Every structure is written in structure tokens, then in C-alpha cells.
């Protein structure tokens, strides 16, 4: 007779997790735009520079 | 008589987890715009190039 001791375990688990969260955020944005423009017509030519 | 030993376990667990978090972020944005334009009228036609 093999003197071996064996065991089986069954387990059930039901978990209810109720969670809260909150947040704020603060953004500070800078920006530097550029522009150039060359216009041309039959007899009218222009140019423009912007920032 | 079956020499088998069985056991049942019941367990209750209440966990209160209070969590803190903080953050910073730093964004650096570049941008290169383009533009072309063709205008046409009864007798007036123009064109424009921008960047």
C-alpha cells in the first residue's frame, strides 16, 4: 500500500468592488504663429508678412 | 467507515484603500503650415503662396 496522502480543494469567490475617482487638470498654452504671402494678378503683385 | 477528513472555510474581508496621485507634464510643439490660392473673377485673377 502506497502511503501517499492526496487532497483536492474546490473554491468559489465572488468579489464586488465599488470604486470612486475624481480629477482636476490645469493647462497653460503658448503659441507663436508665422505667415508670408505672395499675391499676383494681371498687373497687381503684393506680399505680406504676419506673426 | 471512510477515514476522510473534510473541512469548510468561510471568510469575509472588507478593504478600505485610500489613494493619492499627482502629476506634471511639459509639451513642446512645432508646426509648419503651407498654403496656395487661385482667385478668379470676371476680369481679375490672382494667386497666393503662404507658409
Curated annotation (Swiss-Prot), chains A, B:
Site residues (Cleavage), renumbered to this chain: 43-44
Full protein: residues contained: 301 to 351 of 764
Protein name: Protective antigen PA-63
Annotated compartments: Host cell membrane; Host endosome membrane
Subunit note: Homooligomer; homooligomerizes to form homoheptamers (PA-63(7)) or homooctamers (PA-63(8)). PA-63(7) or PA-63(8) form ring-shaped oligomers that are in a pre-pore conformation, which do not penetrate the host membrane. PA-63(8) displays an enhanced stability, suggesting that this form circulates in the blood to reach and exert toxicity even in distant tissues. Interacts with lethal factor (LF) and edema factor (EF); can bind LF and EF simultaneously and interaction takes place following homooligomerization on the host cell membrane.
Region listing for Disordered, in residue ranges: 2-33
Effect of residue 42 to C: Loss of toxicity probably due to loss of capability to translocate LF
Annotated membrane topology: Multi-pass membrane protein
Source species: Bacillus anthracis
Amino acid at each position: 500500500s502506497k502511503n501517499e496522502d492526496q487532497s483536492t480543494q474546490n473554491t468559489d469567490s465572488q468579489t464586488r468592488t465599488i470604486s470612486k475617482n475624481t480629477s482636476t487638470s490645469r493647462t497653460h498654452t503658448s503659441e507663436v504663429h508665422g505667415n508670408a504671402e505672395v499675391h499676383a494678378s494681371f498687373f497687381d503683385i503684393g506680399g505680406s508678412v504676419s506673426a
